[PDB]
Amino acid sequence: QVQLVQSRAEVKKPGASVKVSCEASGYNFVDHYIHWVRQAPGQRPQWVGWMNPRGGGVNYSQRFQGRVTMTRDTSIDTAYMQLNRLTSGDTAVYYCATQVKLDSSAGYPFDIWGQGTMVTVSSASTKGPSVFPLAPSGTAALGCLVKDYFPEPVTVSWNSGALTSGVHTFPAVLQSSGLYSLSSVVTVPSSSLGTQTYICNVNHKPSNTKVDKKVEPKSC
Amino acid sequence: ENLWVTVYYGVPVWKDAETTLFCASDAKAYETEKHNVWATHACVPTDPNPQEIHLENVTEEFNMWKNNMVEQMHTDIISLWDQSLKPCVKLTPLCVTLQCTNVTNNITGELKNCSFNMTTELRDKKQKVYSLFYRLDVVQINSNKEYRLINCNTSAITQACPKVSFEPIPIHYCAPAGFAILKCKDKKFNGTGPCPSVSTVQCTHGIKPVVSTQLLLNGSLAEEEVMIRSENITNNAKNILVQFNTPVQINCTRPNNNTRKSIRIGPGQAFYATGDIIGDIRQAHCNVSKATWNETLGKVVKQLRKHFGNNTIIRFANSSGGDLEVTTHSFNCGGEFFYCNTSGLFNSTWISNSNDSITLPCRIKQIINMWQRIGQAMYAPPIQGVIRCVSNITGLILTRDGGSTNSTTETFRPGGGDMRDNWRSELYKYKVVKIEPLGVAPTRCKRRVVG
Amino acid sequence: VQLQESGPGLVKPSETLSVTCSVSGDSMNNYYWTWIRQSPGKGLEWIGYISDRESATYNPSLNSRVVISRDTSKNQLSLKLNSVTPADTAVYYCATARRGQRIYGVVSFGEFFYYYSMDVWGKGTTVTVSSASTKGPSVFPLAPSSKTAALGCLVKDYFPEPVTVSWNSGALTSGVHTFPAVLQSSGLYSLSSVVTVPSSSLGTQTYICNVNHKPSNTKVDKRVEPKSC
Amino acid sequence: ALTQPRSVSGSPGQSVNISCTGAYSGLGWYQQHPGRAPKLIIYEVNRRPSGVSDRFSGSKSGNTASLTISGLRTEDEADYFCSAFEYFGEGTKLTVLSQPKAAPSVTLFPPSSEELQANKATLVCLISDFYPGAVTVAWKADSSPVKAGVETTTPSKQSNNKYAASSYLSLTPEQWKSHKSYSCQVTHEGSTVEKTVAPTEC
Amino acid sequence: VRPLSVALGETARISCGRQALGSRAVQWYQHRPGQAPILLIYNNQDRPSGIPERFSGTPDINFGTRATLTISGVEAGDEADYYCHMWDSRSGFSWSFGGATRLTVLGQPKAAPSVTLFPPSSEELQANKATLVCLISDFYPGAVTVAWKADSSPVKAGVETTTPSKQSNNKYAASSYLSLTPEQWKSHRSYSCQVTHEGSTVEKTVAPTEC
Amino acid sequence: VFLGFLGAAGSTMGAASMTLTVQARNLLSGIVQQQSNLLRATVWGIKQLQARVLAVERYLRDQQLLGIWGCSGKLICCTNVPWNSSWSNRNLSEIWDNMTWLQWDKEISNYTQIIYGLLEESQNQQEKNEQDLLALD
Ligand SMILES: *[C@@H]1O[C@H](CO)[C@@H](O[C@@H]2O[C@H](CO)[C@@H](O[C@@H]3O[C@H](CO[C@H]4O[C@H](CO)[C@@H](O)[C@H](O)[C@@H]4O[C@@H]4O[C@H](CO)[C@@H](O[C@@H]5O[C@H](CO)[C@H](O)[C@H](O)[C@H]5O)[C@H](O)[C@H]4NC(C)=O)[C@@H](O)[C@H](O[C@H]4O[C@H](CO)[C@@H](O)[C@H](O)[C@@H]4O)[C@@H]3O)[C@H](O)[C@H]2NC(C)=O)[C@H](O)[C@H]1NC(C)=O
Ligand SMILES: *[C@@H]1O[C@H](CO)[C@@H](O[C@@H]2O[C@H](CO)[C@@H](O[C@@H]3O[C@H](CO[C@H]4O[C@H](CO[C@H]5O[C@H](CO)[C@@H](O)[C@H](O)[C@@H]5O)[C@@H](O)[C@H](O[C@H]5O[C@H](CO)[C@@H](O)[C@H](O)[C@@H]5O)[C@@H]4O)[C@@H](O)[C@H](O[C@H]4O[C@H](CO)[C@@H](O)[C@H](O)[C@@H]4O)[C@@H]3O)[C@H](O)[C@H]2NC(C)=O)[C@H](O)[C@H]1NC(C)=O
Ligand SMILES: *[C@@H]1O[C@H](CO)[C@@H](O[C@@H]2O[C@H](CO)[C@@H](O[C@@H]3O[C@H](CO[C@H]4O[C@H](CO)[C@@H](O[C@@H]5O[C@H](CO)[C@@H](O)[C@H](O)[C@@H]5O)[C@H](O)[C@@H]4O)[C@@H](O)[C@H](O[C@H]4O[C@H](CO)[C@@H](O)[C@H](O)[C@@H]4O)[C@@H]3O)[C@H](O)[C@H]2NC(C)=O)[C@H](O)[C@H]1NC(C)=O
Ligand SMILES: *[C@@H]1O[C@H](CO)[C@@H](O[C@@H]2O[C@H](CO)[C@@H](O[C@@H]3O[C@H](CO[C@H]4O[C@H](CO[C@H]5O[C@H](CO[C@H]6O[C@H](CO)[C@@H](O)[C@H](O)[C@@H]6O)[C@@H](O)[C@H](O)[C@@H]5O)[C@@H](O)[C@H](O)[C@@H]4O)[C@@H](O)[C@H](O)[C@@H]3O)[C@H](O)[C@H]2NC(C)=O)[C@H](O)[C@H]1NC(C)=O
Ligand SMILES: *[C@@H]1O[C@H](CO)[C@@H](O[C@@H]2O[C@H](CO)[C@@H](O[C@@H]3O[C@H](CO[C@H]4O[C@H](CO)[C@@H](O)[C@H](O)[C@@H]4O)[C@@H](O)[C@H](O[C@H]4O[C@H](CO)[C@@H](O)[C@H](O)[C@@H]4O)[C@@H]3O)[C@H](O)[C@H]2NC(C)=O)[C@H](O)[C@H]1NC(C)=O
Ligand SMILES: *[C@@H]1O[C@H](CO[C@@H]2O[C@@H](C)[C@@H](O)[C@@H](O)[C@@H]2O)[C@@H](O[C@@H]2O[C@H](CO)[C@@H](O[C@@H]3O[C@H](CO)[C@@H](O)[C@H](O)[C@@H]3O)[C@H](O)[C@H]2NC(C)=O)[C@H](O)[C@H]1NC(C)=O
Ligand SMILES: *[C@@H]1O[C@H](CO)[C@@H](O[C@@H]2O[C@H](CO)[C@@H](O[C@@H]3O[C@H](CO)[C@@H](O)[C@H](O)[C@@H]3O)[C@H](O)[C@H]2NC(C)=O)[C@H](O)[C@H]1NC(C)=O
Ligand SMILES: *[C@@H]1O[C@H](CO)[C@@H](O[C@@H]2O[C@H](CO)[C@@H](O[C@@H]3O[C@H](CO)[C@@H](O)[C@H](O)[C@@H]3O)[C@H](O)[C@H]2NC(C)=O)[C@H](O)[C@H]1NC(C)=O
Ligand SMILES: *[C@@H]1O[C@H](CO)[C@@H](O[C@@H]2O[C@H](CO)[C@@H](O)[C@H](O)[C@H]2NC(C)=O)[C@H](O)[C@H]1NC(C)=O
Ligand SMILES: *[C@@H]1O[C@H](CO[C@@H]2O[C@@H](C)[C@@H](O)[C@@H](O)[C@@H]2O)[C@@H](O)[C@H](O)[C@H]1NC(C)=O
Ligand SMILES: *[C@@H]1O[C@H](CO)[C@@H](O)[C@H](O)[C@H]1NC(C)=O
Ligand SMILES: *[C@@H]1O[C@H](CO)[C@@H](O)[C@H](O)[C@H]1NC(C)=O
């Protein structure tokens, strides 16, 4: 009881529209307003609107009027919102909420919250990962760099699954173009440089992609 | 030096109470028909002269948004509709597949000539009839084409008996003994708070229950400056209620000379279909003098900057949401239900430093689900002849926009989804209290000793 | 502002009928323009119009067979009708139209309609649709009694109507009386023209009948002379 | 214009001092844990919502609100926010120091040979085993500021609850063979290290 | 078509063939067969320059008022076809001119026909064909009987006869043709043409031997 | 001059205690204002009836208190319950002059029940019994 649930996360591209549901239950949906808020992973939350079911009426933050459209389906105790003219600049986490169990009839602020719907807007057209090693030279470090692949995740390994210790991998930065990019590193004894061989592998299902990289031992 | 408590009966002490209030209407009995929806058979006749009694030195708090009287009239009006709808013709059989075609080929078509089978008086016999239906009441289903009424998938429907009238007449409200109604006589009355000038009345003023949207009609006005009353002005979620100081004029017409078709659909039951239009087919509209409307907006932005800064950009825009009944100045006029595009009004920009009357296109429905109510829908029967009713605009209901670029400029569009908001427009000046005639105070008076 | 139509007078079925109207007394741009026909034994039929702005509208009853244009150079309006049938035999009239707007409601919404009044009319042009070939007429003199007297010319066995006849090339106008043509059993036409003249001009004044049959382009000049007695 | 502090130092059993200045500010106070579902802590400015802990209360002014906490925990490590009707303050990441400080283990990598052959040269600097979750990356080829080709991540939670980050200086096979040795300077808690790479190895 | 008859001098009143629904705009046209049409009244009541004030149309003053043409002082010359071009706001574009009211004016002076009969021309007999030509003018009414005789016996071979038609003077004219052979022409003593009109007969005669 | 009903509700307490007949009149009627009205013969009926019951129900509870306090016939009666001064410390001048029954009833909103218990226990439970043993002679 008294809870919000939202539609599934989506990824849409520029221009396109997007409709997100927010199914509400545990309280008589009709009486209370319903506002919608947007958080970017990395800026504040930006209020957008509100819509009483009793009348279905709205008003939208001027940064947002026109592009947005909020709709209800009281037959089912549910609201919606549709955002058109999608640009990459509007990718963010979108939460629905209302004030019900307070004692403040002034409509504000909001306490009851949908978990949220994450919406990624990016022209994440299909682009192929290019994998490049990182050479060695006490101890010596060697790694591999996976670059320029359309949506995550990739999977990287070493020595056909027989070399697992001393390694550390770092999170993929969405490169500003719409290409993810990550890399790996393993620390080996410099006494095995020139004799022992060390190899890296990479995987990416979205395009049925598979890249390897041989690294013969440099004498160092 | 001997202090004794002493009892006083009939002392001027009262307390705030929520109680069962009563109706009041002029004892005008113009029956000479069978109409009258609001005053009914026996709403109690009004006092010839009301005894509005001023109370010296007395200062009382009013709060129209936490008022129990509004949240009472609203429910008071509701029960009367159902009570007037119950004995009337239920249109369960009008949900047949409707075969409808467009009227006009001199297109310069929002209305349909609709043929359908129906039930006759004999249970076994069926009839093919035609009726005219406005576009809003009907929907298409899949060659012909085939159609249905909009309500058939939401609720059942019942037709208002033709005898009943939808005209709001002023209705007062009187309190039982032991209770009292307090009436604020403050012209500059803020939305809420203490009213320095208070009179007491047995009954409220004639409140015309005009059910209307985006604009209050045939109401009570405001003295001096136009009045802005909100529960919280700075809060968008709480509406902003506006009361005018000068009434403007509105002429509303449905310009087609319509006709009523009595179709018998059973023993006693009789459906009133829309017959062929006679004369031109013209769309409903309302004019308001454009000059007067520019005047009225000035008094508004003047009372507005007293709450928004001497300088800020205050513009007006049209409604941007809601049902069809909230997007339009919805109202009833003469028995047909009008829904009017208000964009020509809320179109200007204000910088806070002939008539040429604006015309509003109006659509019309006969199937209505009023009071944001799902369930019993109503068929308003067609009104024979042309319609023209004159209404004053005695108020407005507005609403502001959420967070913009530092509030650079502030924007106002209409809408009033709750109906009580219309009642607050006539009830801000009243409040309910209960009488406490028992007071205790210390005096030197002692009763004669028993011993 | 005066208009005179001209056409082929006869086209065979499935061919194209072309009629034009020459304008005198005024230009073409200040009026809406229109064509109408009258078939023998049936009433008037409205064909279509072309406005000031060269925008043309045609009656849908005609199955898209019509082209109207304003050849503004010759001050001519043109009409061509393809896929003709014998059912198209009629008199074709050109006319100007004055456009009216009758307001019965609000202009901003559009509660008005346009209508047309035809204020200046042409003379008409007769066209027969038949596969039969034209035949130029034979003209014979009808001599006056020798004993006032009436004389004329007989225009025999022609096809189709009409024929123009003048007397002394237009110079003899008082007392001329031409008759409606007879349709013979052979399906050929004949008509007659008579002029009543003073008995005392005979033998000295030459009376020559000028016959113009545009469809077969037969123009015959026929002397009518007095009886030898 | 609605504003509040950005970061606040803290530790268990302590108290944290935060602010928010603005008209009608401190209408409510929220807590977003990394991920989803922000949650109201106190409505108005001093209203224990029915159903929260008692050690929560808030003060304010004519334009400046202030949220107050006693007996800090690691359970209150999240981002905290100031509500103003329509407008929402910037955002304070409250840190509750439960781990000791850790200096970054920095390893800078030059571009590989099969990366130089496809018309590419990416410098790979990996920043690991630091706490709290923060490292500043400053790329300077020959100590001159390079403001071209810089990709930075955000601090990610390792297995050891220390934090990791990585940075990418996108260079060309022509840019990789121009300067003497590209020096990536990782600032940690003020301290700055200098790890350098060149096309001639160790 | 719809026929109507009126006596000279009376006021004729013509109803539209089609009835108006709603707001109307009516133009009236007069056509006598063989002429271009003339606009009599437009926009219901308005009369173009050149039209007598004897003619009036019905103004559209609120609805119900059937469109009517009023003709004061009916003349012989008003015998014509009348068209009501009905335009209204509900019927769409009015492509149809409506039915014609064919106006007959009765009461015109009877006028006996003037008749002239011509024998074959000297040029035609040379071409071996003989046709008799009978021309009839100035009569009213139009009912007329045309018969041919050879000597004094009826003939029905080769006889071709026209429909009577109005002259500019509003009386009627007609003609009759008898197609023969020269052998018929010279072998007979004479031929006669007989024109019967309102109970009276005009008869002329020709002969191969006459001057 | 006679002006109406409750005019002195905001005046000082001494002045208001004088016009108790006027307030006594309007507590029940009621039937001058609304018998039914059964002169002509729904929702208004229910409201009316609920209003009439609420009026006599409130009125009879107040007259009930005066009966067991021996004040049935009177508009003003004095008692034996001493004013324990802790109830209000204002002297006989601050209470009755430059204060309304309202600001007094607000100040006295407490101890009202204690006084009621003292009013029902202290006198009328003893006074009526002493009257029976007294009239025996
Ligand atoms: C619409 O909705 C919004 C919010 O949703 C409403 O905004 C809020 O309304 C509240 C009323 O419901 C109001 O609450 C009052 O707060 C005052 C604050 O005063 C002091 O309170 C604290 C003590 O408990 C102090 O700690 C504070 O620091 C504060 O100090 C002073 O506050 C002044 C307020 O602006 C500030 O500026 C002064 O403003 C005045 C007015 O304009 C003059 O200019 C003056 O010259 C200015 O200096 C001072 O700088 C500041 N001073 C210092 C040293 O900090 C509170 O006092 C009050 O409490 C009343 O009752 C108590 C007893 O219970 C009594 O002791 C008090 O004296 C007082 O009488 C209220 O609780 C909120 O402040 C306000 N804002 C916020 C953010 O919540 C709108 O009002 C709603 N609109 C409508 C139409 O309803
Ligand atoms: C909207 O459209 C309506 C429909 O047209 C229109 O109302 C009509 O307006 C016309 C205008 O011409 C009125 O016509 C007048 O009729 C007078 C006599 O009224 C009798 O006749 C009515 C119709 O007559 C026809 O039908 C009957 C039935 O078969 C037949 O006998 C007749 O011969 C004729 O063909 C008839 O309907 C009417 O009955 C009414 O009352 C009964 C009461 O129970 C009710 O049952 C009916 O339904 C109806 O309501 C009655 O029997 C006639 O005398 C008059 O001429 C004089 O009138 C005035 C008198 O004041 C004089 O000033 C004037 O100069 C003439 O001397 C005229 O012909 C017609 O009556 C109206 N409609 C009805 C139903 O009555 C509206 O005006 C339109 N509104 C707009 C456009 O805004
Ligand atoms: C919505 O749709 C409805 C559809 O019903 C529209 O209403 C309809 O409107 C039409 C048009 O006016 C109307 O038809 C007229 O009918 C008249 C009667 O003639 C017909 O009907 C008779 C029966 O009434 C038939 O039987 C004959 O009756 C004779 C006695 O009158 C009898 O002697 C004979 O032996 C027969 O038994 C008859 O055969 C014929 O079908 C007509 O006078 C009228 O005239 C005009 O239209 C027609 C169509 O071309 C022409 O032929 C005619 O010469 C003239 O120009 C109409 O035909 C129909 O009854 C009516 N229907 C209803 C149910 O009222 C309505 O307009 C639409 N619009 C709106 C807004 O609702
Ligand atoms: C709310 O407000 C609206 C808006 O005002 C009101 O709407 C009016 O409603 C009324 C009643 O229903 C309507 O009244 C009708 O109006 C028409 C027209 O009247 C006007 O025009 C005539 C025209 O005469 C002059 O102009 C002509 C133009 O000539 C040329 O026209 C054509 C242009 O293309 C062309 O094709 C022609 O061939 C021609 O060359 C001249 O020829 C003529 O000689 C004049 O100079 C005037 O006579 C009038 O005075 C008036 O100006 C009338 O025909 C009807 O009788 C009727 O009166 C009115 O039209 C609506 N207004 C508008 C703007 O349309 C509502 O009524 C209001 N409602 C409420 C409840 O208040
Ligand atoms: C309720 O009212 C509705 C109309 O609003 C009526 O619905 C119609 O139902 C009938 C069924 O009786 C449909 O009628 C037609 O059925 C025909 C079958 O043949 C009939 O005619 C022959 C003639 O020799 C008889 O032998 C035979 O027994 C049948 O009587 C089809 O031929 C029809 O198709 C024709 O019409 C449609 C459009 O209507 C065209 O698309 C076709 O090309 C063809 O021209 C049709 O199927 C009829 O379709 C229904 N009406 C409509 C508008 O669709 C009900 O009868 C009435 N009463 C009820 C429901 O009780
Ligand atoms: C309350 O309002 C009263 C006036 O209202 C009247 O009196 C109340 C007691 C109520 O019963 C009301 O219903 C009633 O209408 C104010 O009272 C005024 O007080 C002044 C003293 O400050 C009086 O002045 C005196 O008048 C006499 C008569 O000539 C002189 O001899 C005196 O020397 C002195 O001038 C005044 O008459 C009196 N009345 C009016 C109408 O003002 C009162 O101030 C106010 N507030 C309270 C009682 O707290
Ligand atoms: C008779 O009425 C029907 C509706 O019941 C008409 O059908 C409508 O056809 C139009 C044109 O294809 C559809 O498009 C619409 O055009 C308008 C005008 O620009 C525009 O404002 C709309 O937004 C829409 O794009 C329209 O969708 C369709 N009606 C419905 C309900 O879908 C029909 O044209 C009418 N006339 C006949 C049948 O002669
Ligand atoms: C608000 O005020 C206007 C102004 O009066 C109201 O218009 C009134 O509407 C009623 C109902 O149509 C009219 O009363 C009736 O008129 C008919 C004839 O139309 C008559 O036969 C009846 O006896 C009855 O009097 C009234 O004329 C009309 N007022 C004016 C000035 O025309 C309007 O209805 C009011 N209410 C609402 C909800 O708008
Ligand atoms: C609505 O507006 C009309 C304007 O016509 C008001 O009617 C006027 O009322 C005043 C005072 O009652 C009179 O002095 C005028 O003479 C009235 N105007 C007339 C008769 O044309 C009316 O008061 C307004 N209010 C309501 C509730 O109807
Ligand atoms: C006067 O009354 C004061 C208020 O206390 C009240 O009376 C006592 C008997 C209890 O019932 C208590 O709960 C009430 O709130 C006393 O504090 C005071 O001592 C009393 N003094 C005298 C002299 O009666
Ligand atoms: C309403 O009350 C508030 C509270 O002081 C005040 O700021 C505002 O100006 C008041 N408005 C009016 C019209 O009294
Ligand atoms: C706003 O204007 C009003 C009225 O003209 C005036 O009383 C006031 O001083 C002005 N205030 C400011 C801040 O401009």
Short mmCIF file of C-alpha atoms in Angstrom, two decimals, chain B residues 245-345:
data_model
loop_
_atom_site.label_atom_id
_atom_site.label_comp_id
_atom_site.label_asym_id
_atom_site.label_seq_id
_atom_site.Cartn_x
_atom_site.Cartn_y
_atom_site.Cartn_z
CA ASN B 245 -14.70 44.43 -8.80
CA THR B 246 -16.53 45.26 -12.11
CA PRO B 247 -18.81 42.76 -13.92
CA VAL B 248 -18.33 42.21 -17.56
CA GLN B 249 -21.05 41.14 -20.00
CA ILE B 250 -21.28 37.78 -21.88
CA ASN B 251 -23.87 36.83 -24.50
CA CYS B 252 -24.01 33.07 -25.24
CA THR B 253 -25.98 31.66 -28.09
CA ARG B 254 -26.43 28.27 -29.77
CA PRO B 255 -27.33 29.74 -33.17
CA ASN B 256 -29.24 26.94 -34.84
CA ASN B 257 -32.93 26.50 -34.49
CA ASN B 258 -32.86 22.91 -33.26
CA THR B 259 -35.78 20.48 -32.99
CA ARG B 260 -36.83 17.75 -30.50
CA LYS B 261 -37.84 14.21 -31.63
CA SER B 262 -39.89 12.22 -29.10
CA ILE B 263 -39.06 8.53 -29.87
CA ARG B 264 -40.94 5.92 -27.78
CA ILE B 265 -38.59 3.26 -26.54
CA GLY B 266 -40.90 1.42 -24.22
CA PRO B 267 -44.02 1.74 -22.10
CA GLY B 268 -43.72 5.27 -20.73
CA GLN B 269 -40.06 5.53 -21.55
CA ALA B 270 -39.49 8.10 -24.31
CA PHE B 271 -36.25 9.24 -25.86
CA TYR B 272 -35.81 12.88 -26.98
CA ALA B 273 -33.64 12.74 -30.12
CA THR B 274 -32.19 15.67 -32.01
CA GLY B 275 -34.33 16.32 -35.13
CA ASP B 276 -33.28 18.07 -38.37
CA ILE B 277 -31.80 21.56 -37.85
CA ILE B 278 -34.02 24.32 -39.20
CA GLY B 279 -32.36 27.25 -40.85
CA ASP B 280 -28.70 27.67 -40.93
CA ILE B 281 -26.37 25.38 -39.08
CA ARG B 282 -24.30 27.75 -37.01
CA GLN B 283 -21.83 27.07 -34.12
CA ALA B 284 -22.26 28.25 -30.56
CA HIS B 285 -20.29 31.16 -29.33
CA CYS B 286 -20.02 33.93 -26.78
CA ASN B 287 -18.86 37.50 -27.14
CA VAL B 288 -17.28 39.73 -24.50
CA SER B 289 -16.43 43.35 -25.31
CA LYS B 290 -12.64 43.40 -26.01
CA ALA B 291 -12.42 46.88 -24.57
CA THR B 292 -13.95 45.77 -21.23
CA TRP B 293 -11.66 42.77 -21.10
CA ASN B 294 -8.53 44.99 -21.40
CA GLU B 295 -9.85 47.12 -18.55
CA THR B 296 -10.54 44.14 -16.32
CA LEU B 297 -7.01 42.66 -16.75
CA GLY B 298 -5.42 45.90 -15.58
CA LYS B 299 -7.11 45.75 -12.18
CA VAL B 300 -5.83 42.20 -11.92
CA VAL B 301 -2.15 42.88 -12.61
CA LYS B 302 -2.45 45.79 -10.16
CA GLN B 303 -3.66 43.54 -7.36
CA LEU B 304 -1.06 41.02 -8.51
CA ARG B 305 2.03 43.09 -8.11
CA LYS B 306 1.00 43.68 -4.46
CA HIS B 307 1.97 40.02 -4.14
CA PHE B 308 4.70 39.76 -6.90
CA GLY B 309 6.95 42.80 -6.92
CA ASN B 310 6.40 46.17 -8.48
CA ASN B 311 8.24 44.94 -11.55
CA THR B 312 8.04 41.48 -13.11
CA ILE B 313 6.61 40.31 -16.44
CA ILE B 314 2.93 39.09 -15.99
CA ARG B 315 1.41 37.40 -19.09
CA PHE B 316 -1.69 35.33 -19.77
CA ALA B 317 -1.97 32.07 -21.50
CA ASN B 318 -4.59 29.58 -22.27
CA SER B 319 -5.24 26.32 -20.47
CA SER B 320 -2.71 23.58 -21.20
CA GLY B 321 -4.28 20.42 -19.81
CA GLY B 322 -7.17 18.51 -18.34
CA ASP B 323 -10.29 17.02 -19.64
CA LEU B 324 -12.36 18.67 -22.28
CA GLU B 325 -14.54 19.98 -19.40
CA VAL B 326 -11.48 21.75 -17.81
CA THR B 327 -9.87 23.03 -20.95
CA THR B 328 -12.96 25.06 -21.70
CA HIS B 329 -15.07 27.63 -19.98
CA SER B 330 -17.64 24.83 -19.37
CA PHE B 331 -21.11 25.96 -18.37
CA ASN B 332 -24.76 25.42 -18.98
CA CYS B 333 -26.93 27.77 -20.77
CA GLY B 334 -30.65 27.38 -21.00
CA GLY B 335 -30.30 23.59 -20.70
CA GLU B 336 -27.57 22.86 -23.34
CA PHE B 337 -24.01 22.31 -22.06
CA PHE B 338 -21.41 24.59 -23.58
CA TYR B 339 -17.65 24.16 -23.75
CA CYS B 340 -15.79 27.26 -25.13
CA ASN B 341 -12.25 27.90 -26.45
CA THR B 342 -10.84 30.75 -24.29
CA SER B 343 -7.55 31.48 -26.20
CA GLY B 344 -8.38 34.98 -27.46
CA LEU B 345 -8.54 36.16 -23.85
#
